[PDB]
Design a protein around this ligand. Structure first.
Ligand SMILES: *[C@@H](C)[C@H]1/C(=C/c2[nH]c(/C=C3N=C(/C=C4/NC(=O)C(CC)=C4C)C(C)=C\3CCC(=O)O)c(CCC(=O)O)c2C)NC(=O)[C@@H]1C
Length: 156
């Protein structure tokens, strides 16, 4: 898929921007499961887009909220998962993939929410400057605009 090529390049691009270890792009399914279709990670960590992904327990967040906050267009910034009071159930999943600090950005493409962008890297109780958060939400928007162009010019 030519569109996937763009995603795979964008994941790597934004990974360098926020100095993340891995960047996963979810795709909101019509059933709101939201699977990771494109992801990139440094060769020294673990991947996400793999058929051999073993998680402590399977968890979809996207159906329960059905986009919710992210569908509303609000960003979510997590300085630390133990600090904000995250669910221990999700924390165990997060820490299993070295996720202690992260920022959630919704990827609108077209008229509605297409995917989800996850940026993080073994930071712990770090901070996210708004000037860097706006850039991440900018990448998602730019991707959505591109995605629209590729949607037509792809043809069948
Ligand atoms: C414990 C897991 C119960 C639960 C809680 C819960 N989950 C979220 C948010 C997300 N969970 C995601 C799932 C995965 N799977 C992976 O392999 C992976 C890579 C590390 C992740 C992140 C997921 C993508 C999200 C969305 C990102 C987000 O944090 O919103 C939340 C949010 C609040 C919190 O406490 O973290 C909750 C409450 N969900 C279940 O299904 C379990 C019963």
């Amino acid at each position: 898929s030519d569109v996937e090529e763009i995603f795979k390049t964008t994941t790597q691009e934004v990974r360098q921007l926020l100095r993340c270890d891995r960047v996963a792009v979810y795709r909101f399914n019509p059933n709101w499961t939201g699977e990771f279709v494109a992801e990139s990670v440094a060769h020294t960590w673990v991947k996400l887009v793999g058929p051999d992904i073993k998680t402590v327990w399977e968890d979809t967040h996207l159906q329960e909220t059905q986009g919710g906050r992210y569908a509303q267009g609000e960003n979510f910034v997590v300085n630390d998962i133990y600090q904000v009071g995250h669910s221990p159930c999700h924390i165990e999943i997060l820490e299993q993939f070295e996720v202690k600090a992260y920022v959630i950005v919704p990827v609108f493409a077209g008229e509605q929410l297409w995917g989800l962008l996850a940026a993080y890297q073994n930071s712990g109780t770090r901070d996210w400057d708004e000037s860097e958060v706006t850039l991440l939400a900018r990448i998602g928007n730019q991707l959505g605009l591109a995605l629209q162009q590729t949607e037509y010019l792809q043809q069948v």
